[PDB]
Amino acid sequence: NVVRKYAKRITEWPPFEYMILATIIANCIVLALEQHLPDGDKTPMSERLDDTEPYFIGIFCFEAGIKIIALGFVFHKGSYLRNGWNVMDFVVVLTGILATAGTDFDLRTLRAVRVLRPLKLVSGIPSLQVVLKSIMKAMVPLLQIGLLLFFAILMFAIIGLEF
Amino acid sequence: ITNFDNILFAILTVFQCITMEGWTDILYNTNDAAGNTWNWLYFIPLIIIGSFFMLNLVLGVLSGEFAKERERVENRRAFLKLRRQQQIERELNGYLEWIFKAEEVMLAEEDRNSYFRRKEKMFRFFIRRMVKAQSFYWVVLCVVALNTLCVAMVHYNQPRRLTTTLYFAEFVFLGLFLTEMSLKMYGLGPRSYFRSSFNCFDFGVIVGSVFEVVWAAIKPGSSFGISVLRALRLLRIFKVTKYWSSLRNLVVSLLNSMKSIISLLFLLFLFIVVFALLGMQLFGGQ
Amino acid sequence: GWPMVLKHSVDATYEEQGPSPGYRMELSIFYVVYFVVFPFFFVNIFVAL
Amino acid sequence: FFIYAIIGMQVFGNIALDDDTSINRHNNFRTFLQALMLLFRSATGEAWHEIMLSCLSNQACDEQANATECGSDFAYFYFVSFIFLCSFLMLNLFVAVIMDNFEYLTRDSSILGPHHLDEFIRVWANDMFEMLKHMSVHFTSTLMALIRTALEITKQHQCDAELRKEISVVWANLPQKTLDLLVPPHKP
Amino acid sequence: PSMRPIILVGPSLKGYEVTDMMQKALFDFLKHRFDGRISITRVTADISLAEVQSEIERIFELARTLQLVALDADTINHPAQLSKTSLAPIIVYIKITSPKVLQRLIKSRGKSQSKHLNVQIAASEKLAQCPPEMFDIILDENQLEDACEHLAEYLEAYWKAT
Amino acid sequence: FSSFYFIVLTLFGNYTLLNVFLAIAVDNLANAQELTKDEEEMEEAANQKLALQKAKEVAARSVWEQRASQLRLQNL
Amino acid sequence: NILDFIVVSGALVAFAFSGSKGKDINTIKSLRVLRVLRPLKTIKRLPKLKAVFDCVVNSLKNVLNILIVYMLFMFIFAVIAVQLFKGKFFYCTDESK
Numbered sequence A: 001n002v003v004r005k006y007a008k009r010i011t012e013w014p015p016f017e018y019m020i021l022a023t024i025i026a027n028c029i030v031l032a033l034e035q036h037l038p039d040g041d042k043t044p045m046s047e048r049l050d051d052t053e054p055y056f057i058g059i060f061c062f063e064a065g066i067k068i069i070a071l072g073f074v075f076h077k078g079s080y081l082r083n084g085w086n087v088m089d090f091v092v093v094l095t096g097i098l099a100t101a102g103t104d105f106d107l108r109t110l111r112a113v114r115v116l117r118p119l120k121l122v123s124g125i126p127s128l129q130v131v132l133k134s135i136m137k138a139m140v141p142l143l144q145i146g147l148l149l150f151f152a153i154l155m156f157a158i159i160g161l162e163f
Numbered sequence B: 001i002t003n004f005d006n007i008l009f010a011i012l013t014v015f016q017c018i019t020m021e022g023w024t025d026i027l028y029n030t031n032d033a034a035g036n037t038w039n040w041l042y043f044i045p046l047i048i049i050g051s052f053f054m055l056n057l058v059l060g061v062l063s064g065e066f067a068k069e070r071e072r073v074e075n076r077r078a079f080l081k082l083r084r085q086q087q088i089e090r091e092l093n094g095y096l097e098w099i100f101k102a103e104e105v106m107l108a109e110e111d112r113n114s115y116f117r118r119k120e121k122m123f124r125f126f127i128r129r130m131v132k133a134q135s136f137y138w139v140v141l142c143v144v145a146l147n148t149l150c151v152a153m154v155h156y157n158q159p160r161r162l163t164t165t166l167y168f169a170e171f172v173f174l175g176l177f178l179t180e181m182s183l184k185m186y187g188l189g190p191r192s193y194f195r196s197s198f199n200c201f202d203f204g205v206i207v208g209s210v211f212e213v214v215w216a217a218i219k220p221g222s223s224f225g226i227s228v229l230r231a232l233r234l235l236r237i238f239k240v241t242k243y244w245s246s247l248r249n250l251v252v253s254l255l256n257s258m259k260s261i262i263s264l265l266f267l268l269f270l271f272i273v274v275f276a277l278l279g280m281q282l283f284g285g286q
Numbered sequence C: 001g002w003p004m005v006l007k008h009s010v011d012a013t014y015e016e017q018g019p020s021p022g023y024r025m026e027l028s029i030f031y032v033v034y035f036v037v038f039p040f041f042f043v044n045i046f047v048a049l
Numbered sequence D: 001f002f003i004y005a006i007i008g009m010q011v012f013g014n015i016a017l018d019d020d021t022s023i024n025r026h027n028n029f030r031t032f033l034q035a036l037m038l039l040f041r042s043a044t045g046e047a048w049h050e051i052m053l054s055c056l057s058n059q060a061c062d063e064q065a066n067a068t069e070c071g072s073d074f075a076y077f078y079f080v081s082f083i084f085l086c087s088f089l090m091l092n093l094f095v096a097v098i099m100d101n102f103e104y105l106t107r108d109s110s111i112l113g114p115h116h117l118d119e120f121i122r123v124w125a126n127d128m129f130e131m132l133k134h135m136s137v138h139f140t141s142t143l144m145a146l147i148r149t150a151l152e153i154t155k156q157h158q159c160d161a162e163l164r165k166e167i168s169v170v171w172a173n174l175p176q177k178t179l180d181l182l183v184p185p186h187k188p
Numbered sequence E: 001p002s003m004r005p006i007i008l009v010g011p012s013l014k015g016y017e018v019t020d021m022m023q024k025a026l027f028d029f030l031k032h033r034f035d036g037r038i039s040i041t042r043v044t045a046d047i048s049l050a051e052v053q054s055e056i057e058r059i060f061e062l063a064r065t066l067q068l069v070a071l072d073a074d075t076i077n078h079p080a081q082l083s084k085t086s087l088a089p090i091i092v093y094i095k096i097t098s099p100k101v102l103q104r105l106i107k108s109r110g111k112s113q114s115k116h117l118n119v120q121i122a123a124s125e126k127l128a129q130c131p132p133e134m135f136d137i138i139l140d141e142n143q144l145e146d147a148c149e150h151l152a153e154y155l156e157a158y159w160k161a162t
Numbered sequence F: 001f002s003s004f005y006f007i008v009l010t011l012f013g014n015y016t017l018l019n020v021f022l023a024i025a026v027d028n029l030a031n032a033q034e035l036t037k038d039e040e041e042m043e044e045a046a047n048q049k050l051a052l053q054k055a056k057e058v059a060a061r062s063v064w065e066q067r068a069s070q071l072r073l074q075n076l
Numbered sequence G: 001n002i003l004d005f006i007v008v009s010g011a012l013v014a015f016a017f018s019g020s021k022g023k024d025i026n027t028i029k030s031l032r033v034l035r036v037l038r039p040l041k042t043i044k045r046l047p048k049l050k051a052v053f054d055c056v057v058n059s060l061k062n063v064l065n066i067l068i069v070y071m072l073f074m075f076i077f078a079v080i081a082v083q084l085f086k087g088k089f090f091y092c093t094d095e096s097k
């Protein structure tokens, strides 16, 4: 409740953050270590990489729980789901949890969101966040150029249909 | 896949022509299906309007945004702080030369009347005055230039007399540059030798060259090509030219914002990694 | 035609020998550094100047 | 493009077309228009090195041309210098266009410009109060007054003197009194 | 006196190796540039409080030969510290306009005076608030040669004047 | 419908790349230009003041750069 | 004026060597190609075309400092590449040999 909401704000002591960083790089290396074979074949080491997933999903869920109990959820106008980067972490962890539902259509499209886990490096290093904002600030004026390019492509595509 | 059989196919092939990738094969296909007299009026205007004109607009918008952002309050503050640092360092260098001349004349006066201390200190001052003299500059540039001539003429199937000649010339040049570093470091003092970033470059390059020599002694086959980077010391000829300030301040700005550059080449790496993992998910093994 | 040159560069065994696919695969870092420097950095340096 | 097309025609014009090479029925040098299309292809970077390698020395020469050996090792310089020069000249065109517009590209919404003038033309259709709410001797004096209120050059008499100085500096081409007549309306 | 004697002051406290060495380098240039035209002497008695009076007459009889006289004082760290005495030398000001280069220089100048940095910077600043007209010559240059030629040119002007 | 991967990767990778590297080049080159300009202006300013004081005792621009000055004034 | 003179001289020598003998075809064809500088004459005549040419030359001289650095860096990369892939770009039409 509220007696414990006071304590896990202290839990964000910097070694905890660097341990979350460490598990993020560990997950990135595990993802980069995979190899794909055509027709349902799989390598002898891909099984081990597939068994190492529950530790990662558990650590991410534990981190989300700490951030959800120490902070709010949506209510206090400052909380987990009211931060842009914390929403991406929530999507990643929630979808990883949902991928352990034992159905058919999940695996092909619910395993793909797992590639957004390297972006938790940006989500965990505020300097990278400000650098990313600097990058993306100069590409809002390019929206009109995007509309113009799409209009030119439409006109020339219509002409190509005609001829 | 590259046909105009539909609005979506037409959009896809037009977009592929926009990127100037395989836009002629699509043109050379309409030169066979129909005549070649009128097809260029569809593609040359398309290329001009989609790839040349749009690149022009993107460059203009980006440069305008850069000009607008650069002259804000915090960016201007950072630039003025950098300018202040440069001015302070220049004045401090001048005053340090003042004090060094004072040291020289004083030590000469006490020697005009522990003995090996005085001997070694006057030897140090003589070296430090030598390694800054204009003739040392020219002799070092001559050695560097004669080094690049010995690496620019390595070609396939070169005469065997040339291979041994350059093999021994590499050792001769490594010895000469190690001697030059030793004299310079003893004269200026190690704390001051690394005050100039280009001396850090030279030290790192000769260390890498020694590492390459050792590694080739162990395994003759491989060659890291680090001994060639000594050609970058030819770049000091700009010192005796009216264009030292521009290039030096470019390097100063780069080294100052070398943290905002590494954290830009990293976000690019993160996005390339994300797209690599996405491509492995989608097309992996298929 | 840079991917063709990259393929030849990686698939290069020794002096006066024919290729071998996938050999010397770490020689892509010569072509990643080169694009970082000349096509990406220096081109935009001229465009800015 | 003209110079390079003519050099290509007169040097690489009689290479025998072969659909297995990069000098084809599509990409030859045999006419001014085909050569100019080839140079436009090379400008956009479409396997221009392949064209160079198919334009080198010792190539099969066209049957109806008298010469037996056609093509030349001038292709290295031709193609490399064309890429360099075309890219440089198009960069200069891009930069000239960009700098012809640099006040638009670096525009601020708070600071005025031709946009305010056009919108005031729209105001033609009292409404001046509404536009003052909406802002960032009939339609010229008002324009001068609004420009004065936006950018600043007794202080009112000083502004009038500055307006007179500017009008004297930029007296129009063969006007009797164009800006001078505006000065009586621009004074207050 | 027949001539106004030369007095160096302005960087920081005399007796400390920073000011001592800067003034000594300028002094050595002034000596061996004007060989046969300037007199060299070292002064250790406090003129600002005027054994004390035993040397002022010595200054006159060097200053009475229509030749430049150099005063290697060891206690003057202020132009107004001497303003009450009638000796009236030229107050040459070896000025450095930014305290940060002074502090980094004190750091650069060995290890001993690193702990003497604070008081020396404070007194240098104290002299810095003094008005320029109290001084005779301002040495704002950072290069040795530029300051040397400036002082030498003013000395030539004084030589031609008298 | 698997060509959206390549369309997105060639749109958001040929303009983000350009944005990043052009930002680096423009920022650093403008800093260099302003540094050389300012150090030269200070050099003649100091030289003129020094000549005035020493004699007393003994007795265009590019469009980018003009627009930069205008932006400086406006932001000031 | 040098350009005009070389154009005219090339034309005249090409006319003079017209012996119809076939002794040298490479030389006469080169003297023909030298005619292509002929439209380059109208840039000295038109003042505005000359102004554009001068602006281009001014930009080239503005980037001449970094062009030297660029060619030095590319020389260094070329020498590294020669140390890496010298002699190794040989192959057979038969992949098995």
Ligand SMILES: CC(C)CCC[C@@H](C)[C@H]1CC[C@H]2[C@@H]3CC=C4C[C@@H](OC(=O)CCC(=O)O)CC[C@]4(C)[C@H]3CC[C@]12C
Residues within 6 Å of the ligand: B145, B148, B149, B152, B153, B155, B157
């Ligand atoms: C003075 C400093 C700035 C060094 C710059 C050197 C280069 C500008 C020059 C000097 C050495 C020259 C090289 C000397 C020898 C050769 C080998 C030569 O190879 C052959 O003879 C072909 C092979 C054969 O016939 O067997 C080809 C030109 C080349 C690379 C030359 C090209 C031009 C180089 C690189």
Ligand SMILES: COc1ccccc1-n1nc(C2CC(C)(C)OC(C)(C)C2)cc1-c1ccc(Cl)cc1
Residues within 6 Å of the ligand: B055, C038, C042, C043, C046, C047, D083, D084, D086, D087, D088, D090, D091, D094, G063, G067
């Ligand atoms: C280092 O540069 C090169 C080196 C070799 C070949 C080509 C280039 N190259 N490529 C471009 C491009 C292409 C277009 C469409 C025109 O757009 C921009 C981005 C603006 C440039 C510009 C230059 C260039 C720059 C300066 C000089 Cl001296 C010579 C060439």
Ligand SMILES: CCCCCCCCCCCCCCCC
Residues within 6 Å of the ligand: A159, A163, B034, B038, B039, B041, B042, B045
């Ligand atoms: C008989 C006609 C065969 C195909 C001819 C294609 C010509 C295409 C029409 C011209 C397209 C002009 C683009 C609009 C902008 C300049």
Ligand SMILES: CCCCCCCCCCCCCCCC
Residues within 6 Å of the ligand: B265, B268, B269, B272, C025, C026, C028, C029, C032, C036
């Ligand atoms: C901003 C540029 C970042 C790009 C860095 C990665 C590009 C591809 C590198 C390929 C490395 C292959 C290593 C081979 C090991 C078996």
Ligand SMILES: CCCCCCCCCCCCCCCC
Residues within 6 Å of the ligand: B223, B224, B225, C026, C027, C029, C030, C033, G073, G076, G080
């Ligand atoms: C595994 C041995 C060879 C490694 C492949 C790359 C070697 C060269 C790396 C980059 C060297 C040039 C750096 C840029 C400075 C001009």
Ligand SMILES: CCCCCCCCCCCCCCCC
Residues within 6 Å of the ligand: D057, D071, D072, D073, D074, D077
């Ligand atoms: C039939 C030709 C065989 C090779 C002869 C030509 C060799 C290369 C000549 C390059 C000339 C370039 C400079 C001329 C323009 C500045």
Ligand SMILES: CCCCCCCCCCCCCCCC
Residues within 6 Å of the ligand: B282, F001, F002, F003, F004, F005, F008
């Ligand atoms: C056997 C499967 C047949 C259908 C496959 C269609 C392609 C799958 C969707 C790919 C969409 C890529 C999205 C990338 C967004 C950045």
Ligand SMILES: [Ca+2]
Residues within 6 Å of the ligand: B020, B021, C001, D045, D046, D047
């Ligand atoms: Ca291409």
